């Protein structure tokens, strides 16, 4: 079975009971009883009418659907391998990252020597 929602009051619509209405511009309206349909034809505002769910929703009358909201305290913070770098090699690189000051200094010295050699070669060419 399919259970519907009243347009005027949001009341629960069960198979068999209720009435369906269509306007000139092909709009679906469902009314649970004769009262809601009568008010709809009387052009009474469902929001203004007290016993509909819309008025309660606006005025926060008995609004206790959720006692407290749920929010993410932190991110997933999951670890997964990236491309062909491999998780084991990534972990090895992370472990070897500290105590790299000597390697950085050696690389800087090699780069300085290469720059000096390039400058000498350029001077010789000129």
């Amino acid at each position: 079975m399919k259970v519907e929602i009243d347009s005027f009051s949001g009341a629960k619509i069960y198979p068999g009971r209720g009435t369906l209405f269509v306007r000139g511009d092909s709009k679906i309206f469902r009314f649970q009883n004769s009262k809601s349909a009568s008010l709809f034809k009387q052009r009474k505002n469902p929001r203004r009418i007290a016993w509909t769910v819309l008025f309660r929703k606006h005025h926060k009358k008995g609004i206790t659907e959720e006692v407290a909201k749920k929010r993410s305290r932190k991110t997933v913070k999951a670890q997964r391998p990236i491309t062909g770098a491999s998780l084991d090699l990534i972990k090895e690189r992370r472990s070897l990252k500290p105590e790299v000051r000597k390697a950085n200094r050696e690389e800087k010295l090699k780069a300085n020597k290469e720059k000096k050699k390039a400058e000498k070669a350029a001077r010789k060419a000129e």
Binding site: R80, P81, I82, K97, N104, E107
Partner: protein
């Protein structure tokens, strides 16, 4: 009914064809943002927890969050909104969009696994999919590989190898 389930960390997706009508009743009267029971969704998902992340109904229609309606309606989408991509500068075309409430018309329902239970499923959780590529920003790779301000971050980058049979490229 097709159940498109995604799993992070492993990062794999799979569709389960839930024929049984008693099983898919848990998704009834629900909306994107809630949770469902692994025992309710089926026998082989015992101890599992899922989070609804939209889906599509019959004939194929994007599920937009915040609709809060159980039936489809035609909405005027605009820029920087889902279910619609501006094909021009400022163009805003209206299209019919499936409501956020899940009813007995969702041909394919999309969920994401929140936590893992006792029993493991097929390749969905039995396959590990690595990331497509690493970060590009210097600070990004620094925070990825765990370096310091002066640590020669240029050397510690992705060095994946591609071979044509006679030469290898690190790219």
């Amino acid at each position: 009914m097709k159940l498109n389930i995604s799993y992070p960390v492993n990062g794999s997706q799979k569709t389960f064809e839930i024929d049984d009508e008693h099983r898919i009743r848990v998704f009834f009267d629900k909306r994107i943002g809630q949770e469902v029971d692994g025992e309710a969704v089926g026998d082989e998902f015992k101890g599992y927890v899922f989070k609804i992340s939209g889906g599509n109904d019959k004939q194929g229609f994007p599920m937009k969050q915040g609709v809060l309606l159980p039936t489809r309606i035609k909405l005027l989408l605009t820029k920087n909104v889902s279910c619609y991509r501006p094909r021009r500068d400022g163009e805003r075309k209206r299209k019919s969009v499936r409501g956020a409430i899940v009813g007995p018309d969702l041909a394919v329902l999309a969920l994401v696994i929140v936590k893992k239970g006792e029993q493991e499923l097929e390749g969905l959780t039995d396959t590990t999919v690595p990331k497509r590529l690493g970060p590009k920003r210097a600070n990004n790779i620094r925070k990825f590989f765990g370096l310091s301000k002066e640590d020669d971050v240029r050397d510690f980058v992705i060095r994946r190898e591609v071979t044509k049979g006679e030469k290898t490229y690190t790219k």
